[PDB]
Amino acid sequence: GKYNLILSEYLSFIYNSQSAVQIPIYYSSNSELENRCIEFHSKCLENSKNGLSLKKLFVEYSDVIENATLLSILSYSYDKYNAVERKLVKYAKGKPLEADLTVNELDYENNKITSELFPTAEEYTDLLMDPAILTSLSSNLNAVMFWLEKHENDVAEKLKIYKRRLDLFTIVASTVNKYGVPRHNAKYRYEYEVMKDKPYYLVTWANSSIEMLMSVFSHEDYLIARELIVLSYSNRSTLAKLVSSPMSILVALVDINGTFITNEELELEFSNKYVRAIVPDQTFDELKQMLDNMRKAGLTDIPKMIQDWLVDCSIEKFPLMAKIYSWSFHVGFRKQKMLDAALDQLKTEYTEDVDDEMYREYTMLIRDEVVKMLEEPVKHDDHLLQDSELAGLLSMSSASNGESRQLKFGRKTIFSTKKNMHVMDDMANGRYTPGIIPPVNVDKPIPLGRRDVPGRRTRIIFILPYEYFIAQHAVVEKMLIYAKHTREYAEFYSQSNQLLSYGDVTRFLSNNSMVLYTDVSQWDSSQHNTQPFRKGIIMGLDMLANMTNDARVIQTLNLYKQTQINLMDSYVQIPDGNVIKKIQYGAVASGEKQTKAANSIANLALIKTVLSRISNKYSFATKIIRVDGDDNYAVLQFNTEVTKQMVQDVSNDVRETYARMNTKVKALVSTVGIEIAKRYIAGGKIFFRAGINLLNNEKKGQSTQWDQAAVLYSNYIVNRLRGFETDREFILTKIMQMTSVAITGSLRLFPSERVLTTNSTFKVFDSEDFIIEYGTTDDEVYIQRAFMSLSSQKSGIADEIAASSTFKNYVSRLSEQLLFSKNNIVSRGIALTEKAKLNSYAPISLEKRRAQISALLTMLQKPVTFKSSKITINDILRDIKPFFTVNEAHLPIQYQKFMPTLPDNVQYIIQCIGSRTYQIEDDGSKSAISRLISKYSVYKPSIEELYKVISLHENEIQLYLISLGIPKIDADTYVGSKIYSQDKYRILESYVYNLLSINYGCYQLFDFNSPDLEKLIRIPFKGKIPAVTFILHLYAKLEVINHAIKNGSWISLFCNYPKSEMIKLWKKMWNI
């Protein structure tokens, strides 16, 4: 309830004119007050529409000011062009900045003038520095200047923040004012004709610098920001890659004193174990060279902080490192060219000096792993291998990007890259031919996509046809669904938390063992991911083919095999001007159904093969190896105690034993820590990388101005929890500026906190961070009922595509691969399901969402609507709340910190109740009926459809099950058992279980099975209504936790809930 005051001050500051007028609009769920709001509205518009002073009425209608709820504020203000400079000249009295063109290796990666690199606009491209966000730099500057203006009279630590950010913003505004501000077009692009006389990389530098200086709260933050902002203006290729590299060594220097553990059964369990840090001597010399590069690039204060920290190697000063490790990735992306980014990967050194003893074992281990994965389904003759074709055609992801193509649906032309639409096209013209796999050769090389991420290389993406997916689908699904019952993969270690993705950095650590951890992200072009990998899988397929007798399965397996045959020789379309290059690349990357598990397999075989060579010089027992695609760590335990020389020699042996296979590596051995791209542990404490650029994006999505405010707030929340903290007021300023909409050149509307923070399809943020909010009042109920009525909208483009011939044909062809006695129950169902993935096509989503926003605006302008009773969640919570009773409590501190970078209130909760004892309610459609259909088919009929289908007679249900391949005897047994009344109740239990509101970012981490939280929740037991008592206890926990987060103190609760309200609520439970 504070946002709106900052909104008012922002409006007053930005416009400032006599002509700038401000027009509230209100609402109330109470008839009389609502009609008085209507009145107020009318009279205000009239008075505005009559050149009368508006300031007189504002006293008379005090009632609206006290009890009504705000929606929005309108604004009539004229063009007033160029006001940014007219404000900004004062905050720019320092000296501007000069680039240094002789820093980056390439020529165009320097921050030189555009015209020196792009004389013609026809060859200009903003894609090498595109912020890719529908908000301007001028917007960012306006926000910064307003913040600076309002914080112009404070005298505290706040003033030290203001002086620091003022000096930084002076450096920035000095750099911009040297030339001026670029002006956005309607699309938020920056054309050639504005950037012609300015540096090419000024905008990204500006945005990133704003993001950094808005995240300054201390002196060391100021040092970091001044030392990165002045070098990120020139260096754009060797900065985040440089400073983020030493961290991998630093983790091997932090003594553990107190630890968190994880079980095989995936539960945290703290340990007071102490572990030293047996670091060798030569890695310090490496680290010094890295700091020498750091100083040689032009960094002075931040080497000083890393060198004076090593005098003590304490863990209390250590979050600084983590802080630094996050300050590197908030400088922007290194959006270089498709060509040179591919050539970062497409440099190869293949040699006739490697072993053969290694590759043969490698091939065999891959073979064996494949057989372990595939023994059960290949043998027991599973439907999904038999019906692999249909399985892949249902699971066609509708963003999949195979080969842009000119289509026509009746009377249109479409340039879709989506493979579902391509399949719809190819079914009609007789070209659908999944058994005949296309080649990938000179006659048909592959396109590319570009994956950028700061501090690392630009990675590449294959863009394949749609036959390869269909071939790979069934086998890879059985592989995943097997190996998540098994070690060595992220599918087994993943839900949200600690006790997961790693969960065994910290069992097998002491002064007996070590751990070798290794980044393997460059190992895609390597000589060990070519021929042996493919031939190993091919051999395994031969074994598995001889391990079955049915013929569709042999066909599917032979097609997967032939896919690996064709992918063994693979060329790559890349244009360059007029001519087209195609390069020999017979190796592995993503853009495939297979890449994750197969890379994990190959790395597993590789590390298992390497690890049988250290045994020639050491005695150890391998306790654990873990592989998640392109990373790997192995722990190993010894017959004796560890030394510095053994770690060093082991590292050299690892490096040279990879060198024997012509494989580059930075071998890293340690005792307490690891480092990988996204996270790391030091001293038995998990930190994380907070490298999510807010004001600069990777690529250009398809969302609106609106939703980008929500993504930016989500990234803010994440980065804040991770450690990187930005000023929340700035984020709110951006949200209002991005939800602002131009109805004309001079009319502009601004919504309020009570529209953006309400649970709907229009939610953007929350009134109190780290807490979703619900509604006990009339008013949230009112607007939620209103907005739920409006979420359901239409798309004429979708309507005409779904009314064409190819869509009908597609449903029919899907159908005819199965039985032919259901025509109005599933064909409509499959069409309704395909509709859920036609919306991926951007113009459909844009039509629907622009229509949705227009429907919103035609009740933001004029008064509001009651929406006719359509029930939602807050209706229920409104009835649950008035039988609670609070009392002040006092919990002690008995739980350990193991995520230091969190805010102190969240940590205080962790420091008073426990971290996660994880639970499960359903691992997907478990109840009675989908685990039969998923055994005889793959089809996934929606629970709406089942809730209807069970309500029908038992005859056409019997027909429907027989139509899905099932025999008659099991249907007869199902009807005789009388389970349909049970699966009504199980399905409605599953409907209440669909409430996903346990995992938003702060509820993600808290343990609700705690005894300390539970003794506060004194709700007596009634019985025979499990859903209600479940949700009541859950909701009471959420009340306690949210009060704790927002206020720190604790409370107890009590709900002597009447039986009458249990029953009155029971019918609204299992609806909506």
Binding site: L932, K935, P967, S977
Partner: peptide, 22 residues
């Protein structure tokens, strides 16, 4: 009633006999 489907009856009928013959 957990798992009174077909396709496992066949699996067991096939598995038992093929094991006892092999």
């Amino acid at each position: 009633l957990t798992g009174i489907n077909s396709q496992a009856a066949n699996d067991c009928f096939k598995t038992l006999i093929a094991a006892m013959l092999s």
